[PDB]
Symmetry: D2
Subunit: 367 residues, 4 copies
Amino acid sequence: KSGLGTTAIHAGTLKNLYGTLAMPIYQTSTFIFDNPTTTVLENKIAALEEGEAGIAMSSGMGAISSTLWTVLKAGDHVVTDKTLYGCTFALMNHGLTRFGVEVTFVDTSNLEEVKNAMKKNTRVVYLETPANPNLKIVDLEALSKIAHTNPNTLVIVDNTFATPYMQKPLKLGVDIVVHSATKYLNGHGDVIAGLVVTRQELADQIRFVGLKDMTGAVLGPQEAYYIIRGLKTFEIRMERHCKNARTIVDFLNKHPKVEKVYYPGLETHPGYEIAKKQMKDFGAMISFELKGGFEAGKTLLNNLKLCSLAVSLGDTETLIQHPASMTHSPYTKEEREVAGITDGLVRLSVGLENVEDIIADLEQGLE
Amino acid sequence: KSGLGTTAIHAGTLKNLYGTLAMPIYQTSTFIFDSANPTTTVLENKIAALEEGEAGIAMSSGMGAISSTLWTVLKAGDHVVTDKTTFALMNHGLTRFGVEVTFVDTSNLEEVKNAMKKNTRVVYLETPANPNLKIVDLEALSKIAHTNPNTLVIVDNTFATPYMQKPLKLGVDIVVHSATKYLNGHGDVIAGLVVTRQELADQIRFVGLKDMTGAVLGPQEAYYIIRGLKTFEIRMERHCKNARTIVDFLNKHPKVEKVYYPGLETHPGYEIAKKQMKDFGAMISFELKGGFEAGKTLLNNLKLCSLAVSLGDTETLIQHPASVAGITDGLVRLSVGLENVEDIIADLEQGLEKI
Amino acid sequence: KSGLGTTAIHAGTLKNLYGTLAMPIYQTSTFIFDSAELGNPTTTVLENKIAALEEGEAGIAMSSGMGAISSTLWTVLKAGDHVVTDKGLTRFGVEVTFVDTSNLEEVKNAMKKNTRVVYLETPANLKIVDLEALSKIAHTNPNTLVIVDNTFATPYMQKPLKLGVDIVVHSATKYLNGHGDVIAGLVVTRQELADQIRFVGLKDMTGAVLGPQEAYYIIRGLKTFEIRMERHCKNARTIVDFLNKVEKVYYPGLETHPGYEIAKKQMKDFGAMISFELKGGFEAGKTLLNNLKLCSLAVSLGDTETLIQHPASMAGITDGLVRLSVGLENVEDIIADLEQGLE
Amino acid sequence: SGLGTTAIHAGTLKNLYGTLAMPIYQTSTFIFGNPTTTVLENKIAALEEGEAGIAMSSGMGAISSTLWTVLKAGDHVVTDKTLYGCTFALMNHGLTRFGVEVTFVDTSNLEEVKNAMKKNTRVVYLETPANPNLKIVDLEALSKIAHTNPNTLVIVDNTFATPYMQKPLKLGVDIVVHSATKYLNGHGDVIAGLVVTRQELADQIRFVGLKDMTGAVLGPQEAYYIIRGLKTFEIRMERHCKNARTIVDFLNKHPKVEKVYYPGLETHPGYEIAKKQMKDFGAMISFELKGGFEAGKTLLNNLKLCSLAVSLGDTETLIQHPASMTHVRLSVGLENVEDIIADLEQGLEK
């Protein structure tokens, strides 16, 4: 009965109990007989995703790994994408495989390539949309029905980029939604954290097996506070993030020194029509190709005076990165090529600065 | 040169960098490049200096220290030897992912010698142990475990603390702490610590922590622990002075049958404890001649001691596990605080007269 | 010269010295010195920030709004000085005359020779006062300083130093921090009075030191300062019309509001506080307030949650007076909760 | 119960929160003064054995909030000329600028405090031990003089000694104040002040001086840190003193030092007064090197453990040379005394 800002600001409040609207910080570890702060944040994110239960962990990787250590075992099979955000790619290709888990990598945008990758022992289909680093879109509802043909399969979606402001995968059939709260949900570049939302049945097992026993990735109470506090402005931050991005996209698309732009809002974008039906907005992550390749990325980034060179995203400050010179410096040509880092690719996370100043720093920087 | 107090206070200082003795709290999730966590790092160096290992790693819980390590050094097929009495992970979690586990009485040197398989990748130890404060010989066990070129010895040093016991000086490969207890000292942080040689540490950081657990300690929690470490030596002193005065009062007491404490010569592994440990701890278990209700009643009339399951806090904690494996139904576990010993004893003395 | 969001987010940052955009929290009391040959780096960033937003020379942080005004007042006054402000000090040899600061002539005719401080607050039933016109007046005495509590308006609507005011003070406790969890005060003015207020008022007279943690919190709050104020006012504009269809509504954006023209002239926006007067008595207000789901019953202003107050149940005040602090919620849910409660 | 148990447990709300650790009420807005800070106010007040405690955001915040409450233009203050730095500035240039009379005497001489009383003398303000040479004064006898005048409150700055050593309220003092920034927090990471006094006096200090005249509010996080720091308050002071006592012996005999000011040295002016007020003689040491100015510089610039800083009462040993910096004082920290002595010796060499 209540809107997104309202939900984020008030869901889970304990004002009738403490007399404060602001949740006290229970910086404690010894409860007495004869964590409250984290719970509020868990009830909040659940409300925002419209699921039954939330779980907080100390990082995005803590939220994913705790979930996968709970619902997997040796002998299980996992279907995911050839390109995921790293760290979860290392967990998939190197970590689970040392412990008897089969992992098939496919193009999740191809619906049938997902269908025929599936086996009796498939326990997890794990998806990302939008996804690094060309913002691949992927039809979550189409994929969830092509995976529940197997009555034992869970669909897990990393909803970090879209946030519950643009996408609620649990409404499109998904079973488990995971967030890197480090990005947009906290929003303030000062917290590593992760969140999970799923049914109460599943959530209780991820908390009491995967979190308590398999990772121990507890979120600190002060960090739980920082995220509750961050959420008070979640809605207007995403509004300004997305409003700034759209203008920056047009700037980059009509720029002579720029060859291509990757952005789910463009109609030239691959999964454009898919992106339009499941996303209320087209996101604040923009990627684009540079004409002058490697040395054009270096020179562009080395002249920007307002944008900050970093490999996080979702901060109130605008962050820019050039995977080839930085993140993927010690890689091969074909390691980077497919998929999908090229020599000119630049990643931008649009912050909340006044868009005129972001573009002015972009403009002078492109020359 | 430096004493334990000097080491815990100054090891890893960056006072040359910030012009401050107190380490700034780098509450950040984004580092920026010149071209195309220091708070936690200070704490990682601190625990390493105290245990006299190469390298420290911090995690958001004790279980995040232990799990991060085991996901690093194990794979499907490996075998683990550990003690009978973290248990869910050993007994249910690893076995679900193709690791084999043998539980033995690490008390008996030859049960360990005989549980050794060739694919034994980890001997995982803990001393003193729960809840009867079982002692276990770390040096003897490392020689046993190391006749396999591939076996790592991992010791949970949470109870002993590097004030009383440095397992790496006795041949151990890896030390883990639930920093939640004595190292932080203040009942207000969940956190874990690992100390090992540089190459094992790098692998635990960049495989176990980064990809397998993601148990990142919050910078603010790191700061609290650094601050807790400023009083680590005097706290362990007062913990252990208190605890010894209290042990006597409980041994020579009418309604207490037995008192589990490594400092008593009647305690099973007292001679091992005495060579291993610079002191005998601040955990006291004991049994009341009343069993249950001894027991469930004594704990109800306590007015200073608090009813909790954690340990190593500034306040004295107590619990009665009966409210099948070591838990004799008259057993009571005391975690001795920093209070004045008169007041703890008087409180205990009072609540003992109520039965 | 960048936009309000860019300077709120980026002004005063030491991002190339720490390798992070987030300022390290210097939870410290004692600095070491390199060789044998009163301020905090985190706090210092905050002071630089509010100074850049007010387009002033220097900022000072204090552990409360009252710490901010009392620190400056104990600097710039002595026994025998005189103060004029709008309808404590007197126990220590300063005389205070209270005038209606919206009567230009009533202020000008109250200027004594020993008048050292004129202290204004606009908005305040949201009374407006002409800050430029009142400053020319006070400035007829060379040793008179004008001090404006710019808390209600913000540097997003009002920059008093650009209208000839000498000192801006804020209870950052309200809009600037935004999130209801910090008591703090701020002061912006010229460098040399700033150094006087710090080294005398703050150092010896009050000791009202802002904690570095609270300073970090406020810097964080300022990261969304521009978009919070946008959203606040927009919600206020929609709720103000709704409330105005209760006999009367006090809001500087209604042209039927007394200082509407001074307001339009000085304030780039009309603010996010609303007062209105309920037709029913002392017991129709308390009945409304004892009956809202969303709005919360509290005496403060500028949070993310919408707050409301019936100053009667909780001279100036009537039995039908209600103060509304419009939060950041979705507008329809706010309006719905006002509505359901009015019935 | 004992001083450790009190500092750990006084003011507990374990019955209501289900935790031994006080949650951090990081709030400004209450629905229908702070619960974390309150727990700390009851803690200090139990430690000093007064009725009520107040917390301010600074030692100066504690002091000025007290003075701005109990004084008025026309009143008179008797205080010492050797006073803590910023208390001096306030007393000398601040009160006098708002109608207050201050006479600076030597509070060692009971005859010249008696002879500085006036009918309108509202406050006698004392400091024992006192900078920069650990001066001692008789709290009983001075409170007996001041109280012959029926409107005179005696205010004592109990920072150095702390309630581990000196409880002025039991010696007849009316108000005790603290820079909790030092020993009480203990950890060199908080700026805070504390007042302990009678309830009626405290309510006025709270609701006049704090609420209206200074607004020197302690943040709730800073309040949490101090409650935490107090969890070990007893054992830090015990170790502070044992270290400093041994450094005292060492410093008293080193050929390159003239005199060693410390209250436990029976050679010290005021020794027998300290022996009756003080349960222990403190952890500040000062001394004079025969090399004078260039000896101080060259000592402090060869210390590798002792840190060169202004403050005192931290877990780290702090050192400062009053001729090189503020215009030799030693704050003994919690290190092993052997390490501290050896760092002093290798630096005394030079």
